[PDB]
């Protein structure tokens, strides 16, 4: 299951849900600008 907002993630293997992206500073899912 994909990862929702503010869940811990890995930018190199980004499993954040559609429209989200793994933050490089915090490594949690944030809104994709």
């Amino acid at each position, epitope marked *: 299951d994909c990862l929702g907002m503010f869940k*811990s*993630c890995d*930018p190199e293997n980004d499993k954040c849900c559609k429209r989200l992206v793994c933050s*490089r500073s915090h490594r949690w899912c944030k809104w994709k600008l």
Partner: antibody
Framework: QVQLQQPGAELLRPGASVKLSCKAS????????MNWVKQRPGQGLELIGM????????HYNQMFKDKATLTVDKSSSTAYMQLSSLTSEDSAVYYC????????????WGQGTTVTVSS | DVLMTQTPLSLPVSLGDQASISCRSS???????????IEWYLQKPGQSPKLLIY???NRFSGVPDRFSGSGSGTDFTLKISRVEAEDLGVYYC?????????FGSGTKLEIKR
């Protein structure tokens, strides 16, 4: 080729301010974190702060929170670092550095601007 | 902010011998995502730093087996085996896990001859 262009050297008077420039080329400027690093003669590297040029999200190291201000100009792909009320303690080499796309390492560096604070 | 201490502050080493540099953090460098973002940089006089090791033990492109990074949690080590004359300079550890990211104090490797 990823390149970060910084002026080699600047001489400033005590009490003045300076806005250091780091001109990025050869990559998508808004998609990589920019970092500024201070290094006094014969001393260590000190991270000043970092900025995400896409939305100017900033994070400052505690020593520089009140002292440094990070901004970007998207139209010229330039990162800036402003210091105010300069003293001889501010004489140092100031580097800009790019974080890689995945946020796991610094991949490219400017050549550093040596600031001299002197009358 | 997270403190990164290096020991020793300077390290004289004979050619062919091994140099070992310790990096200790004030807080675990394990991230909430389970990864550990420790990097090692080498700086030569008058030059910008260059990356050697990232994520504790990953060697950057072209960096030989003889540069080895290890450790976990709060304690990390860079070992440089079979030291060469050109290895002199200041080695810095760095943590990129906890904002704001921080550099270690630096260790100056000097060559004995």
């Amino acid at each position: 080729q990823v390149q970060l262009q910084q002026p080699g050297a600047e001489l400033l008077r005590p009490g003045a301010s300076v806005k250091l420039s780091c001109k990025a080329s050869g990559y998508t400027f808004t998609n990589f974190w920019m970092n500024w690093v201070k290094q006094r003669p014969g001393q260590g590297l000190e991270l000043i702060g970092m900025i995400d040029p896409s939305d100017s999200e900033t994070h400052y190291n505690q020593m520089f929170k009140d002292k440094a201000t990070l901004t970007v100009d998207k139209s010229s792909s330039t990162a800036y670092m402003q210091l105010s009320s300069l003293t001889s303690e501010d004489s140092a080499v100031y580097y800009c550095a790019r974080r890689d796309y995945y946020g796991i390492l610094f991949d490219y560096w400017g050549q550093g601007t040596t600031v001299t604070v002197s009358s | 902010d997270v403190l990164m201490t290096q020991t020793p502050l300077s390290l004289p080493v004979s050619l062919g011998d091994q140099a070992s540099i310790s990096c200790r953090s004030s807080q675990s460098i394990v991230h909430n995502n389970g990864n550990t973002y420790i990097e090692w940089y080498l700086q030569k006089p008058g030059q910008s730093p260059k990356l050697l090791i990232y994520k504790v033990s990953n060697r950057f492109s072209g960096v030989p087996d003889r540069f080895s990074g290890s450790g976990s949690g709060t304690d990390f080590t860079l070992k440089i085996s079979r030291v060469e004359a050109e290895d002199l300079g200041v080695y810095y550890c760095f943590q990129g896990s906890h904002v704001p990211f921080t550099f270690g104090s630096g260790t100056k490797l000097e060559i004995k001859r």
